[PDB]
Amino acid sequence: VETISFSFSEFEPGNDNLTLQGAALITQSGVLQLTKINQNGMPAWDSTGRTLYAKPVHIWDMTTGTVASFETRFSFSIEQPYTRPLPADGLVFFMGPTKSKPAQGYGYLGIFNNSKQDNSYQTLGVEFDTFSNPWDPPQVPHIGIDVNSIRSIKTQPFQLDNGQVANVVIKYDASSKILHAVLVYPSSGAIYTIAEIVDVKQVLPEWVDVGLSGATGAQRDAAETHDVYSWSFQASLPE
Amino acid sequence: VETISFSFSEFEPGNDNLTLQGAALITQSGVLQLTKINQNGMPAWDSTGRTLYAKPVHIWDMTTGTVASFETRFSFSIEQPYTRPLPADGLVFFMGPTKSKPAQGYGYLGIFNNSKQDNSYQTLGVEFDTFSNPWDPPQVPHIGIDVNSIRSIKTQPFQLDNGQVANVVIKYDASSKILHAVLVYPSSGAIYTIAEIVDVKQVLPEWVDVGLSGATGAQRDAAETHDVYSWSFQASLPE
Ligand SMILES: *[C@@H]1O[C@H](CO)[C@@H](O[C@@H]2O[C@H](CO)[C@@H](O[C@@H]3O[C@H](CO[C@H]4O[C@H](CO)[C@@H](O)[C@H](O)[C@@H]4O)[C@@H](O)[C@H](O[C@H]4O[C@H](CO)[C@@H](O)[C@H](O)[C@@H]4O)[C@@H]3O[C@@H]3OC[C@@H](O)[C@H](O)[C@H]3O)[C@H](O)[C@H]2NC(C)=O)[C@H](O[C@@H]2O[C@@H](C)[C@@H](O)[C@@H](O)[C@@H]2O)[C@H]1NC(C)=O
Ligand SMILES: *[C@@H]1O[C@H](CO)[C@@H](O[C@@H]2O[C@H](CO)[C@@H](O[C@@H]3O[C@H](CO[C@H]4O[C@H](CO)[C@@H](O)[C@H](O)[C@@H]4O)[C@@H](O)[C@H](O[C@H]4O[C@H](CO)[C@@H](O)[C@H](O)[C@@H]4O)[C@@H]3O[C@@H]3OC[C@@H](O)[C@H](O)[C@H]3O)[C@H](O)[C@H]2NC(C)=O)[C@H](O[C@@H]2O[C@@H](C)[C@@H](O)[C@@H](O)[C@@H]2O)[C@H]1NC(C)=O
Ligand SMILES: CC(=O)N[C@@H]1[C@@H](O)[C@@H](O)[C@@H](CO)O[C@@H]1O
Ligand SMILES: CC(=O)N[C@@H]1[C@@H](O)[C@@H](O)[C@@H](CO)O[C@@H]1O
Ligand SMILES: [Ca+2]
Ligand SMILES: [Ca+2]
Ligand SMILES: [Mn+2]
Ligand SMILES: [Mn+2]
Structure with a gap:
């Protein structure tokens, strides 16, 4: 069995186990700021940052023909x-082709170039979307499986x-092909759950890079923070 | 669309919206004690109680051929x-044939009569099992989809x-046939998730009773409490 795992209870500046792209930065306090402050x-608006x-x-x-089961957790x-203009755009956990660079920002969250369903993207993502684009449901924020x-x-x-820490758990069971995600806010006790069938063999390449991406809006002050405090991941491929 | 929903933020003694069976009792403090104290x-050991x-x-x-999506939440x-003997047996949220009475207690949790996979049971359940029977995995406690x-x-x-309040969310999406459950302990921040494909049309009758059942052990002091503080449920059948 081929296993891989990592766990960052906090982030240390200068760490060579993470690839920072765009505006992403690790502070002295150990926080991963995906978008610029x-x-x-x-x-800051017009900011895109990723960490792989x-x-x-x-x-x-x-x-x-075997596929790996995996689980990731982050806070x-x-x-x-600001009350005006509307904040944007959100953050997303994703898996895609290796050696990738940031794509379009804003509503595309740094991982897509347009709003088309294109097999060439070879990307799976779980988004936490804060701005309603024309392709989005009217309710924001929302968790979405991309x-x-x-x-x-x-x-x-x-x-x-607002400003409170949220805990996320995303699990993929290869046998059932179910991708299930949970978001919990310890501050209020709120629990949100979402699940869907996803056959990764029809989407992703055999080897992928795993990461987090965040983006702020296309207009002045259409922004918000996208801070990450911890991130763990484990995958097991049965052979 | 045929919808049904209920929400008990606390339980009131004498309430005619709940059917108490076996040892189940609602205290003056508003707590639903499934098993005897x-x-x-x-x-007390050798106790079985249910609430429908x-x-x-x-x-x-x-x-x-339409099937309802549903969601239930309870704490x-x-x-x-005691350290000895080992505590038992657990509690379970279930759906089964209408007008049912308690089945066997102990490891059967008040909803089964034996350890066979019998289509005549017509029962779906999400258990929180505290004792490892011969049909159980060695790890207890565990959440299980029955x-x-x-x-x-x-x-x-x-x-x-031990003794802390746990929050449970169980959701069934009819379109994908996914039953996903989450257990969260606010006291420690622990989050557990479990999901599986279940086609309810192959298991349950068209009309069912929904309930909670709990049971204590077959030997002296092989027991634990099974207290419920709140319970909400909603189901929507597209027509
Ligand atoms: C977070 O980043 C950390 C820093 O990079 C990761 O730890 C490094 O992990 C490297 C594995 O990829 C590991 O590399 C090996 O280092 C050996 C020498 O260092 C050890 O031994 C020294 C004494 O001899 C001692 O002084 C050191 O303190 C270390 O104990 C070296 O012998 C290895 O070489 C063999 O294997 C390579 C292939 O991997 C062959 O090419 C080579 O011929 C030989 O057979 C190996 O060296 C690395 O080889 C590849 C090359 O590109 C690298 O430059 C070269 O370093 C390295 O020792 C540690 N560093 C430290 C300080 O521990 C960490 O990885 C995790 O932890 C390690 C221990 C391992 O379990 C990994 O699988 C884990 O992922 C990163 N953590 C995460 C979660 O990503
Ligand atoms: C928790 O338990 C509560 C107590 O049982 C539930 O509330 C009851 O819900 C009953 C519905 O099943 C409802 O019954 C109706 O009562 C009507 C008379 O009472 C009202 O109007 C009076 C003035 O006329 C007023 O004084 C009262 O305070 C009430 O406002 C009555 O007219 C209805 O009869 C019609 O419908 C029945 C069929 O349902 C026909 O048979 C009949 O011919 C007529 O057409 C009806 O009466 C009930 O009929 C069936 C019979 O077996 C019952 O004995 C008889 O009562 C009842 O009014 C309320 N009680 C109260 C105090 O509000 C509660 O139900 C939820 O809330 C209600 C309001 C409703 O929305 C339900 O759908 C909800 O489930 C339970 N809550 C939950 C979550 O289960
Ligand atoms: C398509 C596109 O980039 N849309 C963006 C949207 O994502 C958000 O950034 C918004 C802020 O006002 O500006 C545009 O509408
Ligand atoms: C099959 C059966 O009922 N087994 C029970 C088990 O469920 C538990 O109650 C235990 C307590 O010591 O006693 C028996 O082993
Ligand atoms: Ca959006
Ligand atoms: Ca058991
Ligand atoms: Mn969206
Ligand atoms: Mn069990």
């Missing part, structure tokens, strides 16, 4: 300081607890 | 006062936070 302490684990993960094998907080498109195959609205 | 305040909602729920229609606590049998089709071990 200005000197005045306010979140430094080693590729073997998700499935074409020869044997984040989103603070929206399969080769920013147009989610399933969404679940949730109430943002 | 002696005058000395200790849980007073109205049957339309889960699916044979004529149109409970299990206190295990389909016409006490021998779960899927299990997920969890660590009991």
Whole structure:
């Protein structure tokens, strides 16, 4: 069995196990700030940042046809300081082709280039979307399961607890092909759940990079923070 | 669309919306004690209790072939006062034929009569099992999805936070046929998730009773409490 796992209870600056892209930065306090925070302490608009684990993960094998089961857990907080304009755009946990660079920001969250369902993306993502684009349901924020498109195959609205830490658990069981995600806010006790069938062999390449991406809006002050405090991941490929 | 819903933020003694069976009792403090608590305040062994909602729920229609999506949420606590003998047996949320009475207690949790996979049971259950029987995995406690049998089709071990309140969310999406459950302990922040494919049309009758059942052990002091503080449920059958 081929297993891979990592656990960051906090982030240390200078760590070579994470690939920081775009605006992503690790503070001295051990926080991963996906999107830019200005000197005045306010979140900057027109910002895109990603963080990828430094080693590729073997998700499935074409020869044997076996697929890996995996689980990831992370904690984040989103603070929206202004009433106007509407905050944007969100953050997303994703898996896609290795050696990838940031795609389009804003509503595309740094992982897509347009709003089409294109098999060439070879990307699976679980988004926490804060702005309603034309391809989105009217309710924001919402959790969404993205399969080769920013147009989610399933969404679940949730109430943002401004600035509070949210705990996320995402699990994929290869036998049943179920991707199940949970979001919990310890501050209010709120629990949100979402699940859908996803056959990763029809979406992802055999080896993928795993990461987090965040993005702020296309207009002045259409922004919010996208801070991550911890991140763990484990995958097991039966051989 | 045929919808049904109920929400008990607390339980009131004398309420005619709940059918209490066996040892089940609602205290003056508003707590639903599924299994017996002696005058000395200790849980009694050889006790079985259930609570069913007073109205049957339309889960699916044979004529149109449509099936309902549903969600239930409840909070409970299990206190295990002794080191020896091992505590038992657990509690379970279930759906089965209408007008049913308690079945065998102990490891059968008040909803099964033996350890066979029998289609005649017509029962679906999500258990929180505290004792390892011969049909159980060695790890206890564990969450389990029971389909016409006490021998779960899927299990997920969890660590009991003795006497602390646990929050449970169980959701069934008819379109994908996914039954997903989550258990969260606010006291420790622990989150457990479990999911599996279950086609209710192959298990349950068109109309079912929904309830909670709990049971203590077959030997002296092999017991624990099974207290429920709140319970909500909603089901929607598309027509
Ligand atoms: C977080 O980042 C950490 C820093 O990079 C990761 O730890 C490194 O993990 C490396 C594995 O990829 C590991 O590399 C090996 O280092 C050996 C020498 O260092 C050890 O022994 C020294 C004494 O001899 C001692 O002084 C050191 O303190 C270490 O104990 C070296 O012998 C190995 O070489 C063999 O294997 C390579 C292939 O991997 C062959 O090419 C080579 O011929 C030989 O057979 C190996 O060296 C690395 O080889 C590849 C090359 O590109 C690298 O430059 C070279 O370093 C390295 O020792 C540790 N560093 C430390 C300080 O521990 C950490 O990885 C996790 O933890 C390690 C221990 C391992 O279990 C990994 O699988 C884990 O992922 C990162 N953590 C995470 C979660 O990603
Ligand atoms: C928790 O338990 C509560 C107590 O039982 C539930 O509330 C009852 O819900 C009954 C519905 O099943 C409801 O029954 C009706 O009562 C009507 C008379 O009472 C009202 O009007 C009076 C003035 O006329 C007023 O004084 C009262 O305070 C009430 O406002 C009565 O007219 C209805 O009869 C019609 O419908 C029946 C069929 O249901 C026909 O048979 C009949 O010919 C007529 O057409 C009806 O009466 C009931 O009929 C069936 C019979 O077996 C019953 O004995 C008889 O009572 C009842 O009014 C309320 N009680 C109260 C105090 O509100 C509660 O139900 C939920 O809330 C209600 C309001 C409703 O929305 C339900 O759908 C909800 O489930 C239970 N809650 C839950 C979550 O289960
Ligand atoms: C398609 C696109 O990028 N849309 C963006 C949206 O994502 C958000 O950033 C918004 C902020 O006002 O600006 C545009 O509408
Ligand atoms: C099959 C059966 O009822 N087994 C029971 C088990 O469920 C538990 O109650 C135990 C307590 O010591 O006693 C027996 O082993
Ligand atoms: Ca959006
Ligand atoms: Ca058992
Ligand atoms: Mn969206
Ligand atoms: Mn069991």
